[PDB]
Design a protein around this nucleic acid. Structure first.
Length: 1312
RNA sequence: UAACUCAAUUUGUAAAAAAGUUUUAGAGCUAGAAAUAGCAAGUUAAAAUAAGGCUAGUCCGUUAUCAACUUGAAAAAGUG
DNA sequence: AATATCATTTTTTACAAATTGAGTTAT
DNA sequence: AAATGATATTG
C-alpha cells in the first residue's frame, strides 16, 4: 500500500521548486535514513522543497575567445611566413636579427643577444630612432626614397603592414587619388546629362561640408538643402548618398521595373554596373564613374589628411603629420604652462597617476580621459585658442595607434607594402621572385564558409581537403576544396525532411517547391456567380491554365487582378465572389517571373520534360553568396546559354530553405492512387483536398509511409530551442521528478503539474538613428542611462509628441502623462514597450474594453506609418494599433486573450511536458494505444500568482528561498482542481491526444469557483456530473494555509565545480609577490609580471604533515587547499604527487575529500555554511518567518478592508525584528552589523507604517542564504560581513544532500 | 498540429579589425657623499595575449554535464 | 579582524534553426 | 551589468 499522490514543479533559470500533494490537497512527511558517522541514524522531511543553482551560460563569451585565439595564432604565422622568406639573405646581413626580435621581451639577464634589437649596438640603434621617430617615418621613406635600404629596415616596414594589416570590409582595389575638385566633376558630368535641370555649385567649397566630423546622412542633408532645386531622393541626391557610403535604388530614374541597387564596396558592383548600363545606354557610366572617384575620396578624406601629389604612402605620411603636430602643440603647451601657470607643471607632465600628459603617455589615461582633464586648463590660459579648436575636433596630441585606426582597409596597407617591394627588388633579387607571396601573405584570408583548416581533430571544422598536404596562403585554393566546403558549411546546418528524416530538404526558392506552394493554395479557393446554387471549389481539370495565364505573366497575383482578368476575359463572368484567399495570394512564382526574365524563354522554362538541370541552378544560387564560387558551379549549364543568358544568372542569388523534400513533394506516391502529392494538388477531382489532407487520408499509404520511415535525455534537452539558461531548469526538473517517484516506492504520480517564468547605446542605435532619420534637428535642440526610467524612454520614442493625437509634449511636468497599453492589459499581460504607449490622457485613446478607436486610428494613422519607416516601432505594434481599422478585437479575440491568459501555448513548456509525459507513460493496450497513467498539466504562470493575491497567501521574495517551493505546491492543488471542476479541459490543459461570450465567460470566470462573493457561490464545489467532490472551501483553504506555515522546507543549492578562464585576464606589472602567475613557463613574474586571482575549480581536504624548523620535524595539519582550474588537470593526474610538491608529506590519500562550491557544513546550533572556494564561506542558513508575519509585510509595504489589518496587529515589527536578531546572533555571527540594524530601527520608529516595512524587507539580505551583501536600512548602508576562513568547517559536519534534499549523508570531520 | 505570407526576438557556428595590457629597445642632462633639488624627453616598436596539449592541425584549450556510497573508461546503473 | 580596490574592450562579415504574433488553407 | 572571491593594506 502507497496512497495516491501528485507533483507540483516551478521551473526557473535559477530555481526548480517541487512539492508532493495527496488526495485532500495535503503534502506528506517521511522518515528517511541519514548515512555516514553522525549521532543521527534518521530524520523526518516534508515532501516539499526547492533546488537553487547558479544560472547556466551561453557559449558566446567562450566562442568569441576561441575565434579570437585562432586570429592570434594565424597573425603569428603570417610573420612566421614573411620571416621564412627573409631567412637566408638576412643571415648574410645580420648573423641573428630575427633572433634579437624573438627575445626582445626578455630582460637583459635572460637575453642572449645584444639588448638593442634592430642593429645590435647603441650608436646605430640610438641613431635609428632620432632619424625615424615612428615606424611610419620608415614606412614613408622606404616607399618614397629610391636609395637601396638596409634589408632589416625593409623587413620591419613589411611586417608592420602585414602584422597590423587593417580591414576586409571593401572588395576590389581602391587607389587613393584625392573633394571639391572631384565633386564639381560630378556636377558637370550630370549637368550635360540632365541638360534641363542644370545644377549650380556657384563657388561654395563642398570640401568643407563633406570632410567634417559629422556622420553619413547628416552631411548629405547639409548639401541637398544648399542645392535648392535638386531632390535629395533624386539621382544627384542618390549619387551623393553613394559618395558618402550609402546604398541607393536606381530603378525609377531610367524607367526600369527591377530594384537595380548598387553598393560601392562589393564585387557585385562591377557585375551590377554592366547590368544597369545594359538598360539605359553606355553614356551613363561617367555618373557612377564620378561617384566611385568621390566615394573612395570620401572613405580617404576621413582616414588621411595629406595630398596624393607629394607621397605614395598617404596613410604613413598622414600619421607623420599627427606626430609633427603632436611635437609642435606639446612644445607650445610646454612654454605656455611655464609662462602662465608653472605651479601646475609637475602634475601635468611628470605625475602619471593624475590624467595629465604623463597620465596620457606613460599612465593608463586614454585620449578621452586626457581631453576632459586638459580642456579646463587650455580654456583659462589665454593664447591657447587653436589647441582647444584642435581638442574640440579630436585632433590635439594624437598617438598614431588609436581606438579609431579601425577604418584603414588592407587596401591602404597593401598600398605602401607594394611600393617598398617594388623599390628594393631592383636591388635585392628575392623580393622580385617573392613580390607575389609577400603581398599575398597580407592579402589572403580564410573564407568564412571554410572555417578552421583542420585535419580531423576539430569538433568545429567541416572543410574537405582536395589532397593531403600543409595549407598555406599560396597553396590554399589548390590543396583545399573551396566549393565542397562552402557547400558543407550550409548542408550541415539546413534541416532534413520532417516526413523522411534521412532525406534532405529543398531550397525555399526551388521551382518544384514554388509550384507546390501555389497549387496547394489554389486547390481550396472557392468562387460564386449569378447562376450557381452553392459556392464551387476550383475546376481540377481546368486549373492547368489559371496558372498558365495569371500566375506566370507576373510575380504577385491580385484577387482583384484575378476576379477582373479571369472573370472579365477567361471566365466571361461579370461579377464574382471569392472564399479562398484574402486580398493577394500568399503563393507567388517569384522563380518563374525571375527565370523567364533572365533566360528570355517560357517554352523551355515552362518545359516539364527535363526540369532536373534547373533544379541545381537554383540550389547553386541558394547554397552560395561568394560570386566567384557561383561562377565555377554555373559554368557547366552555360554550355547552352550565351554570355547574357548565363551572366545575369550570377546576379540573382536566393535566400532560405523550405520545410519539405523533393521525395515528399513529388516522389512518395501510391500504388492505389497512381500520382504524387504535387500531381494530386492539381485536381483531387471535384474534391481538390490539401497537402495536410493528402497526408492524413486513410484512403492512401502516405499517412503511414511518413510515420513508417521514422538520443538520450541530455541530448534531448540540448536539442530544445531556448536560453541554455532555462535548459538547465528543464533537465534538473526531470531529475527531480525521477527521484520523487523513487521516494514514493517506485509508484508513478496520478498527476504532474509544471510552470515556467519569464544596451542603452543599443537603444541610442535605433532611438537616435530612428529620430534622426525623419530629419528634424530636435536631437540638436534636446540631445544612455536615462531610458531605463520608462516615461523618458517613451517620450524620446515618439518625437517629443503624443502617440494618439500628434500634440507636442513636456519634460518638467511630464509626470501627469499616463502610459496606456495598446491592447488593454485586461486582454494581454505585456509589460513590454511594444504594447505600452504614453499620451496626454489614456481616456484620449478611446474606451479601455477594446482596441484604439477608429477616429484616433484615422488621425494618427499616417503618423503610425512614419514611426515604422524610422524603425522606432514594429509591424505587430502598428498592426494592432490600427486593429479598429480592420474590424476591432471581436468577442472571439477577447475570448482568445482571456483563454491565452491561463492556457500555456509557449513551445518550451509543451516540450518540457512532452518529455515528462513520454518518460512516465511507457506502457500500451490491446489495440496498441498508450496508457496515460500520468497526466501532465501545463499551467500558465499567473493562476497561482493571483490565487495568492485573491485568497491571502501573498509571497515575499526577500524572506527566504521557500516561495519557489510553495509555488510548486500551489500549482499542484490548482492543477488538480481546474482538472476535476472542468474535466473537459484535459484537451486544453493536458499533454495527451458573434456568440463568442460562451468561451469568454467560461475562461474569464474559470478561477471564480474557488470564491464565495461574486456579483454567492456554494461551499463544497464538486464535479457537476460525478459524486467526486474537489474543493471543501471550509477544510481545503486551511490545509494550504497550513502547508505555507511548515517552516522545515527542503532548500538545496547544486554543488558545482567551477570552470572557464583561469584568473582575471589583466596582465599586472612585475610585483615581488608569490600570488603573480607566470604568463609563460619561463617568464618569472618577479621580472615580467603576470596574472593574479585564479578562479578555483574545487577544494580538497588534505590531511598530512609539513616539516617544521631547519630540523624538518614533521608537524601534522588538516586544511582546505584549493585546486585551481589551471592546477586541476595536474592534481587529477596524480593527487598525492601534486600535494607532495606543495609541501605536504605522507598525505592520507583516502581522506582527500573533493569539496566543490556550495558544499554544505553544519557547525553548531544548526548554524550552516556553504564554502565558495577554499578560504571563504557563505551563509548556509534559511530562516522561516511564520505565515503570520509574511502576509502582514505585503500589506505593510502596500481592498480598503484589509488595510485595517495593517494598523491593527501592527508593531508586529518588534517580533519580526526579534526573529532576525535571534538569527543574526545564532547562525549569522555578524555582530557590529546587527548592532547597527537595531541602533537604526529604533531611530526610525517615528517614520510611517510602510516606510518601516519596506526597510525591513531590505533587512533580510543580512539573514539571506548565500554570500553576504551590502544593504541600506534607510540612509545607513550596512557593508557585507564576509566569512574569510574555512578553519571553522574543518572539524564540523559536512552534509551530502540529494537533489530534493531527502536523502542525506552527514560526515563528521572529527578525523586526523 | 501541418504548409504558406509579412515583420521582430533567441540560440549556435565561421572568417576578419582596432585597441588595451605586460617586459625589453628608444645612451637622459647637469649640482651633491647622499638623500634631493633644477631642466630636458614623451607620439614608436618587437613579443605574449589563457599555463599549455598531442591528435602536431595555419588544430585544440573558458559552453553544456557534476550529492554521497558500491559498479563502470565513460555514458550510466544500483543503494535508503 | 574591519576595510578598501579590483575585475579586457570594441568593431565588421557570412550562415543556419526556433520561437512569437498578425494573417490564408486544412487534419 | 553587476556581484563576489582574490588581493592587499591596516593599528
Amino acid at each position: 500500500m502507497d496512497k495516491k499522490y501528485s507533483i507540483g514543479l516551478a521551473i526557473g533559470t535559477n530555481s526548480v521548486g517541487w512539492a508532493v500533494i495527496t488526495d485532500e490537497y495535503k503534502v506528506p512527511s517521511k522518515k528517511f535514513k541519514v548515512l555516514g558517522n553522525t549521532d543521527r541514524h534518521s530524520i523526518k522531511k516534508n515532501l516539499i522543497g526547492a533546488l537553487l543553482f547558479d544560472s547556466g551560460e551561453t557559449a558566446e563569451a567562450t566562442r568569441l575567445k576561441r575565434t579570437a585565439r585562432r586570429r592570434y595564432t594565424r597573425r603569428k604565422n603570417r610573420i612566421c611566413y614573411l620571416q621564412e622568406i627573409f631567412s637566408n639573405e638576412m643571415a648574410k646581413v645580420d648573423d641573428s636579427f630575427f633572433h634579437r626580435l624573438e627575445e626582445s621581451f626578455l630582460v637583459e639577464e635572460d637575453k642572449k643577444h645584444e639588448r638593442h634589437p634592430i642593429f645590435g649596438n647603441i650608436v646605430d640603434e640610438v641613431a635609428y630612432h632620432e632619424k625615424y621617430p615612428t615606424i611610419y617615418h620608415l614606412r614613408k621613406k622606404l616607399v618614397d626614397s629610391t636609395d637601396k635600404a638596409d634589408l632589416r629596415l625593409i623587413y620591419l616596414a613589411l611586417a608592420h603592414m602585414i602584422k597590423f594589416r587593417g580591414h576586409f570590409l571593401i572588395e576590389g582595389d581602391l587607389n587613393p587619388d584625392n573633394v571639391d575638385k572631384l565633386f564639381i566633376q560630378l556636377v558637370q558630368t550630370y549637368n550635360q546629362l540632365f541638360e534641363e535641370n542644370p545644377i549650380n555649385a556657384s563657388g561654395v567649397d563642398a570640401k568643407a561640408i563633406l570632410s567634417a566630423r559629422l556622420s553619413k546622412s547628416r552631411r548629405l542633408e547639409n548639401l541637398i538643402a544648399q542645392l535648392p532645386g535638386e531632390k535629395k531622393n533624386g539621382l544627384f541626391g542618390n549619387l551623393i548618398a553613394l559618395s558618402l557610403g550609402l546604398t541607393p535604388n536606381f530603378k525609377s530614374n531610367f524607367d526600369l521595373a527591377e530594384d537595380t541597387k548598387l553598393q560601392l564596396s562589393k564585387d557585385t558592383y562591377d557585375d551590377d554596373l554592366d547590368n544597369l548600363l545594359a538598360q539605359i545606354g553606355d553614356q551613363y557610366a561617367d555618373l557612377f564613374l564620378a561617384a566611385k572617384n568621390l566615394s573612395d575620396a570620401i572613405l580617404l578624406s576621413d582616414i588621411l589628411r595629406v595630398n596624393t601629389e607629394i607621397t605614395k604612402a598617404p596613410l604613413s605620411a598622414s600619421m607623420i603629420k599627427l606626430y609633427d603636430e603632436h611635437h609642435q602643440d606639446l612644445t607650445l603647451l610646454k612654454a605656455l604652462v611655464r609662462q602662465q601657470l608653472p605651479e601646475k607643471y609637475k602634475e601635468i607632465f611628470f605625475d602619471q597617476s593624475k590624467n595629465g600628459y604623463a597620465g596620457y603617455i606613460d599612465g593608463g589615461a586614454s585620449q578621452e580621459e586626457f581631453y576632459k582633464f586638459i580642456k579646463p586648463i587650455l580654456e583659462k590660459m589665454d593664447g591657447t585658442e587653436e589647441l582647444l579648436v584642435k581638442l574640440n575636433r579630436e585632433d590635439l596630441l594624437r598617438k598614431q595607434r588609436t581606438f579609431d585606426n579601425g577604418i584603414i582597409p588592407h587596401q591602404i596597407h597593401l598600398g605602401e607594402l607594394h611600393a617598398i617591394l617594388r623599390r628594393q627588388e631592383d636591388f635585392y633579387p628575392f623580393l622580385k621572385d617573392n613580390r607575389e607571396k609577400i603581398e599575398k601573405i597580407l592579402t589572403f584570408r580564410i573564407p568564412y564558409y571554410v572555417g578552421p583548416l583542420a585535419r580531423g581533430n576539430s569538433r568545429f571544422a567541416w572543410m574537405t581537403r582536395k589532397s593531403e598536404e600543409t595549407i598555406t596562403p599560396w597553396n590554399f585554393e589548390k590543396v583545399v576544396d573551396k566549393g565542397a566546403s562552402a557547400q558543407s558549411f550550409i548542408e550541415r546546418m539546413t534541416n532534413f525532411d520532417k516526413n523522411l528524416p534521412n532525406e534532405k530538404v529543398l531550397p525555399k526558392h526551388s521551382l518544384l517547391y514554388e509550384y507546390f506552394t501555389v497549387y496547394n493554395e489554389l486547390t481550396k479557393v472557392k468562387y460564386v456567380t449569378e447562376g450557381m446554387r452553392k459556392p464551387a471549389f476550383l475546376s481540377g481539370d481546368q486549373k492547368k491554365a489559371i496558372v498558365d495565364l495569371l500566375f506566370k505573366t507576373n510575380r504577385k497575383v491580385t484577387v482583384k487582378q484575378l476576379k477582373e482578368d479571369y472573370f472579365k476575359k477567361i471566365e466571361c463572368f461579370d461579377s464574382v465572389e471569392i472564399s479562398g484567399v484574402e486580398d493577394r495570394f500568399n503563393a507567388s512564382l517569384g522563380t518563374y517571373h525571375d527565370l523567364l526574365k533572365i533566360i528570355k524563354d517560357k517554352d523551355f522554362l515552362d518545359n516539364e520534360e527535363n526540369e532536373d538541370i534547373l533544379e541545381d541552378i537554383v540550389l547553386t544560387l541558394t547554397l552560395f553568396e561568394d560570386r566567384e564560387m557561383i561562377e565555377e558551379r554555373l559554368k557547366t549549364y552555360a554550355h547552352l546559354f550565351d554570355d547574357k543568358v548565363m551572366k545575369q544568372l550570377k546576379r540573382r542569388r536566393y535566400t532560405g530553405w523550405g520545410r519539405l523534400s523533393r521525395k515528399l513533394i513529388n516522389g512518395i506516391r501510391d500504388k492505389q492512387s497512381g500520382k504524387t502529392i504535387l500531381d494530386f494538388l492539381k485536381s483531387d477531382g471535384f474534391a481538390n483536398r490539401n497537402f495536410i489532407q493528402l497526408i492524413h487520408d486513410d484512403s492512401l499509404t502516405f499517412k503511414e509511409d511518413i510515420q513508417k520511415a521514422q538520443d538520450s535525455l541530455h541530448e534531448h534537452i540540448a536539442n530544445l530551442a531556448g536560453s541554455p539558461a532555462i535548459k538547465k531548469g528543464i533537465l534538473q526538473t526531470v531529475k527531480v521528478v525521477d527521484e520523487l517517484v523513487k521516494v514514493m516506492g517506485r509508484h508513478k504520480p496520478e498527476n504532474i503539474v509544471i510552470e515556467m517564468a519569464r544596451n542603452s547605446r543599443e537603444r541610442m542605435k535605433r532611438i537616435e538613428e530612428g529620430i534622426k532619420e525623419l530629419g528634424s534637428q530636435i536631437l540638436k535642440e534636446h540631445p544612455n542611462t536615462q531610458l531605463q526610467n520608462e516615461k523618458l524612454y517613451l517620450y524620446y520614442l515618439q518625437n517629443g509628441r503624443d502617440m494618439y493625437v500628434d500634440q507636442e509634449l513636456d519634460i518638467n511636468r511630464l509626470s501627469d502623462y499616463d502610459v496606456d497599453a495598446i491592447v488593454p492589459q485586461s486582454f494581454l499581460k505585456d509589460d513590454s514597450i511594444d504594447n505600452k504607449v504614453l499620451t496626454r490622457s489614456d481616456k484620449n485613446r478611446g474606451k479601455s474594453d477594446n482596441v484604439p478607436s477608429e477616429e484616433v486610428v484615422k488621425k494618427m494613422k499616417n503618423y503610425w506609418r512614419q514611426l515604422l519607416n524610422a524603425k522606432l516601432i514594429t509591424q505587430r505594434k502598428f498592426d494592432n494599433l490600427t486593429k479598429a481599422e480592420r474590424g476591432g478585437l471581436s468577442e472571439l479575440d477577447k475570448a482568445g486573450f482571456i483563454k491565452r491568459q491561463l492556457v500555456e501555448t509557449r513551445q518550451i513548456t509543451k516540450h518540457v511536458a512532452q518529455i515528462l509525459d513520454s518518460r512516465m507513460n511507457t506502457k500500451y493496450d490491446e489495440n496498441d494505444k498508450l496508457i496515460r497513467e500520468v497526466k501532465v498539466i501545463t499551467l500558465k504562470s499567473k493562476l497561482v500568482s493571483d490565487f495568492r493575491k485573491d485568497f491571502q497567501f501573498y509571497k515575499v521574495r526577500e524572506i527566504n528561498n521557500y516561495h519557489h517551493a510553495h509555488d510548486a505546491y500551489l500549482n499542484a492543488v490548482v492543477g488538480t482542481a481546474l482538472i476535476k471542476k472542468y474535466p473537459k479541459l484535459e484537451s486544453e490543459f493536458v499533454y495527451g491526444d458573434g456568440k463568442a461570450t460562451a468561451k469568454y465567460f467560461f475562461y474569464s470566470n474559470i478561477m471564480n469557483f474557488f470564491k464565495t462573493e461574486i456579483t454567492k457561490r456554494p461551499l463544497i464545489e464538486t464535479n457537476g456530473e460525478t459524486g467526486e467532490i474537489v474543493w471543501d472551501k471550509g477544510r481545503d483553504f486551511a490545509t494550504v494555509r497550513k502547508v505555507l506555515s511548515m517552516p522545515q522546507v527542503n532548500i538545496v543549492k547544486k554543488t558545482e565545480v567551477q570552470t572557464g578562464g583561469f584568473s582575471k585576464e589583466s596582465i599586472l606589472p612585475k610585483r615581488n609577490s608569490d600570488k603573480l602567475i607566470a604568463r609563460k613557463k619561463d617568464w618569472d613574474p618577479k621580472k615580467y609580471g603576470g596574472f593574479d586571482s585564479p578562479t578555483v575549480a574545487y577544494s580538497v581536504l588534505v590531511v598530512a604533515k609539513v616539516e617544521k624548523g631547519k630540523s624538518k620535524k614533521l608537524k601534522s595539519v588538516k586544511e582546505l587547499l584549493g585546486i585551481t582550474i589551471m592546477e586541476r588537470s595536474s592534481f587529477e593526474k596524480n593527487p598525492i604527487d601534486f600535494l607532495e610538491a606543495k609541501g605536504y608529506k605522507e598525505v592520507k590519500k583516502d581522506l582527500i575529500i573533493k569539496l566543490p562550491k556550495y558544499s554544505l557544513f553544519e557547525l553548531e546550533n544548526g548554524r550552516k555554511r556553504m564554502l565558495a572556494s577554499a578560504g571563504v564561506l557563505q551563509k548556509g542558513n534559511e530562516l522561516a518567518l511564520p505565515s503570520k508575519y509574511v502576509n502582514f509585510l505585503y500589506l505593510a509595504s502596500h481592498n480598503e478592508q484589509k488595510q485595517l489589518f495593517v494598523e491593527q496587529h501592527k508593531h508586529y515589527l518588534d517580533e519580526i525584528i526579534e526573529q532576525i536578531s535571534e538569527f543574526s546572533k545564532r547562525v549569522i555571527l555578524a555582530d557590529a552589523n546587527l548592532d547597527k540594524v537595531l541602533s537604526a530601527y529604533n531611530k526610525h520608529r517615528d517614520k510611517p507604517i510602510r516606510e518601516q516595512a519596506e526597510n525591513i524587507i531590505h533587512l533580510f539580505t543580512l539573514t539571506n542564504l548565500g554570500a553576504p551583501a551590502a544593504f541600506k536600512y534607510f540612509d545607513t548602508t550596512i557593508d557585507r560581513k564576509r566569512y574569510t576562513s574555512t578553519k571553522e568547517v574543518l572539524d564540523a559536519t559536512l552534509i551530502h544532500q540529494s537533489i530534493t534534499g531527502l536523502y542525506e549523508t552527514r560526515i563528521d570531520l572529527s578525523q586526523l
